[PDB]
Amino acid sequence: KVFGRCELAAAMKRHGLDNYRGYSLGNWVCAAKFESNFNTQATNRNTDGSTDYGILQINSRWWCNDGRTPGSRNLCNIPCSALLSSDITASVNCAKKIVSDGNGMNAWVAWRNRCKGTDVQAWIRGCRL
Ligand SMILES: [Br-]
Ligand SMILES: [Br-]
Ligand SMILES: [Br-]
Ligand SMILES: [Br-]
Ligand SMILES: [Br-]
Ligand SMILES: [Br-]
Ligand SMILES: [Br-]
Ligand code: NA
Prior knowledge:
Blueprint: H1 5-14, H2 25-36, E1 43-45, E2 51-53, E3 58-59, H3 89-99, H4 109-114
Antiparallel strand pairs: 1-2, 2-3
Helix pairs in contact: 1-2
One bromide ion is lined by residues 21-22, 104.
PDB class: hydrolase
Keywords: hydrolase
Assembly: monomeric
């Protein structure tokens, strides 16, 4: 599923991601934009053999199991395929764990390089929230 901007903002809010760990909804929408272009089916291979999955490109190195990342963890206790669903519940719940692990949203390189310190409210501007 490719979400619209305000559609994704609403779904993220419904799943309690807005202001989670002090990160406003605009931060999460901006992260999703540059990680996946709002596409739940996005996948990308990393150089080390791990793969990033879903709307927030969660890494199989640590967070999910995809059966082909030797030595990796599965801290969200989920198949990586669950992170590709049209329903974003699994991605949101796993993202809540990731953003809580000490480094906040810096865990998402695209957020740090393209959202952090920017006018992130722009990403929810005009949305009926
Ligand atoms: Br957009
Ligand atoms: Br915001
Ligand atoms: Br594995
Ligand atoms: Br393979
Ligand atoms: Br684990
Ligand atoms: Br949803
Ligand atoms: Br933080
Ligand atoms: Na894994």
